[PDB]
């Protein structure tokens, strides 16, 4: 989820 600085 690229919407955050939190993905992968």
């Amino acid at each position, epitope marked *: 989820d690229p*919407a955050f600085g939190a*993905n992968s």
Partner: single-chain antibody
Amino acid sequence: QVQLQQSGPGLVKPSQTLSLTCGISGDSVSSKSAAWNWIRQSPSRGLEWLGRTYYRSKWHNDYAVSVKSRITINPDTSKNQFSLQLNSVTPEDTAVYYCARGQMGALDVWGQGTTVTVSSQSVLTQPPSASGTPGQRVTISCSGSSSNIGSYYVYWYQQFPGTAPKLLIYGNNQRPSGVPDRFSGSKSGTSASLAITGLQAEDEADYYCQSYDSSLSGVIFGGGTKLTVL
């Protein structure tokens, strides 16, 4: 603490527009760490993510494939709220609608939900049902692909009937404070697992696996697993 208050009609005529409003308290709608989602749920469509809006130096909008051409999610910075607009509704759009906050890919805070009736790859793979006897360790699996689980975080939710899903596992294997350590998560390749040690009658609920798919450009949910304690 952060709470979300939902408002909207419980019935919309076909071909008409459904409008929902979600009020925020304890957080800003322009938060750099938050994203504001809409999710609906029905026996036919399952747990279906609808879309989201969020602020990263500008307002962004990510919509689901299924409702992209009919959906609009606008934030209101003054009233500190965000709305849902779905045009040309049909009986298929009959579901329970939730607004939820995403903070790290996890839907940690949910609204109580609004039942909306309309009258005159895409889904992660979970076992339809799981079961176990008290005291056992029970594990629920979820298989995906490189486009989703193989490349992104895995989240788990616990949902008791008539209530919004509760965050159980975030970031594959991390656990929010308050959640007992009986619940554990794991991820390897394109598969994930939710383990419940010391199974209790309390654990009888529906369990959902959640991730993100780059090919779908949106949040993807699993079919959900109904856990029965024998």
